[PDB]
Structures are given as C-alpha cells and as structure tokens.
Structure 1
Amino acid sequence: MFFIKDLSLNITLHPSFFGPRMKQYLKTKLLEEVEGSCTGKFGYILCVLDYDNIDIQRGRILPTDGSAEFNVKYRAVVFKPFKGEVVDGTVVSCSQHGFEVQVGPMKVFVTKHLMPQDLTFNAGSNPPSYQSSEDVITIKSRIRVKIEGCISQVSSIHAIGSIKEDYLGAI
C-alpha cells in the first residue's frame, strides 16, 4: 500500500552526459527508472516528490569505466504491499487457475483454491469468469481482496490473494 519514503539511489552517469548542465540530466535519469519501477526493498515507486531540490552528492568517478556515480537522496511515494492486507481492486484477467485483480500498478493473483466453493469456472461464457449462486465476478468488476502472501524479488513483486474471508469480494 501507499507510503512516502526518503530514498537514496546510486546512478551511473555516463561521461557522454558531462555537459554544463548535469543536474537536470541526473534528475531526468532518476525520473525514468524510478517512476513505475518495482523494487522489493520498498515496493512499486510511483512518483518522486520535492523535484525542485534533490540532494545530489559529489559524484564518484569509477576507476575502470570512467562513469560518474552519484548517490542521489530523494523523497518519493511508494507502493509496498504486505501479507494480511485487504484491498479493493478490479479484475483484469481470469482463468481456470484463478483471476488477476489490479490493485494500483499490481496484478494480485487469486488462486483457484482460494475462493469459497460456491464460485466455479465457466469457460463457455464470454468472458470466462467465476460464477457463484449469489454473485458473479467478471472482468473489470469491483472486488475486495485480501493478500495472504507477497514474494518480492530484486525488481518484481507478486502477491497471493483470496476472497474466502467474510466481507470480501464485490462490494
């Protein structure tokens, strides 16, 4: 979920960008690979705050490839999920293995062993969705899902969702 953090990033500035105006180049090259970037250390970083002043240290010239190495300390909003967290979202894809719900920039999977037994798969219906005796869960449908387990790699985060808990599912 949504946090704000003070992060320090190490950036390889190439010697080709040693122009008179490296500050906006450094801020820009911060701003491609952070916006929407996923890190397992802090979650999905979305937007960088305090763009007018960002702490830029005196850069390290690496002794082999000549590139400048800057430890830029910045403040940004992040999306770090956890397990045990219930969130709202919309289903973007479904299958017999389960369905993917979109919570922010994240596609949380709900596995086929994690719905209540009333829901069942019907591939004959277009789009193929999960149908129960009391509700139906299709593509682009509102649903409330709880996350029971999240795995975070160095650059990717995957989560496990369910709707077996009471007061979950479609609102």
Structure 2
Amino acid sequence: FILSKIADLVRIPPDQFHRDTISAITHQLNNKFANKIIPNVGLCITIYDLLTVEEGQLKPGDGSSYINVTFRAVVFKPFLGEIVTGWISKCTAEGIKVSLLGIFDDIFIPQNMLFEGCYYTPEESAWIWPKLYFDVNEKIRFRIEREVFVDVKPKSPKEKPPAYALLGSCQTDGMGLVSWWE
C-alpha cells in the first residue's frame, strides 16, 4: 500500500445540489477509480482526502457543475522486493500461480529461480522437491521481483490480459509454507 497524489476534474449533476459539495465529489470520485487500474502508479483501492478545491465553471450547453480538484488516493504496491502472504489457485506446467485473497489473483511465479529440484508432472501431482511439496488451500509466502505494464484492447460487448501483473523469485529458504517453521 502507498498514497498517490493526483489531480482530476469532476462533473456533478443538478441532482446532488441538495447535498454538500465534499459529499458529492466523494461519491463521484468513487465511481471514477475504485477497483479500476490506474496506469503506471499501481492499483488503487480507496479515496482519502480532498484538497485545493476551487470555484467550478459552467459550459453553455449543459447546466451541470464542472470542478477541477486534486486529491490523494490510496493505491497498492509494496515495493520491488517485499514478501507478502498469499496462496496458489490454479496450475499447469509453467510455475505456480499464487493468489492473494483480498486484492487480485494476478501474481504468478513461474519456476526458473525457484529451488533446483522442482518439476511439474502430468500425473496430476502438482510439484515435487528433492523438501516435500504443497498444494492449493495452503498459505504461501511469495517475494516480489519483476513488474510489467501494458495497454488495453478495445472493449467487446456480449488472451493477453496483463493489466496489472507481478512476479517474483522465492529461492531463499523458508518460503511457500508457514508450517515448516514452529
């Protein structure tokens, strides 16, 4: 988690005139970002405070209220090398894909830098170490290494979806299972 500082312009309809500005701008800003991904600054969660707000203007052919304000929104990314709790979900032979419940399943760690004795089997047995192994529903500690950013394809109303994707290297001992200790 980290706190970004950004600016933006808000359009509030006549329907919200009965309430207070700060309350109106709040709801609007919530409909703006929320769960949506903000480019290059990481993924955003919620909104914090409101500053710099000034007199809003009006365009001739509408009748609404356009206000340009800046605010600090709470976003998400720990840092380059942080270790954080999670667990795997799905799998094939590439590497394990660890999902942190509460943010996204986007985290995926292929097996390259992992322990020297790891291999996938078609036998439906997930993975094997020369110690032991584990599977889904069990908590996993994973470290961050690499981060990538891409653009988006046009939306199609009724695969390459790497909107926000993080991967890492777990080779340092004591990772992937918390009951090995204690």
- Counterparts of 2:151 and 2:59 in 1: how far apart (Å)? 24
Could you tell me which amino acid in structure 1 is paired with residue 2 of structure 2?
F
TM-score (norm 1): 0.73
Question: Does the aligned pair in 2 maintain the 1:122–1:129 contact within 8 Å?
Answer: yes
Structure 1 residue aligned with 2:36: 37
The structure with the larger Rg is 2
Q: Which moved more, 1:59-68 or 1:83-92?
A: 59-68
- Post-superposition Cα deviations, 1:90-120, rounded to whole Å, max 9, x if no partner, equal 1122221222212351321101323213222
Mapped partners of 2:60, 2:41: distance in 1: 30
- Which position in structure 1 is the counterpart of 2:95? 98
Alignment CA distance shift 1:63-1:87 (3 Å): farther
Shift of 1:30: 0.8
- Relative to the length of structure 2, the TM-score reads 0.69
Higher relative contact order (CA 8 A, sep 6+): 1
- Find the partner of 2:166 among 148, 155, 159: 159
Give unpaired runs (5+ residues) of structure 2.
153-162
- 1:110-125 to 2 correspondence within 5 Å? 110-125=109-124
CA RMSD in angstroms comes to 3.1
Indicate the SS of the match to 2:131.
Answer: coil
The gaps in structure 1 that reach 5 residues or longer are: none
Q: 1:140 aligns with which of 137, 141, 157?
A: 137
Determine which structure has the larger strand proportion and give its number: 1
Q: Could you tell me the percent identity over the aligned residues? A: 22
Paired residues in the alignment total 162
| Offset of residue 79 of structure 1 | 0.9
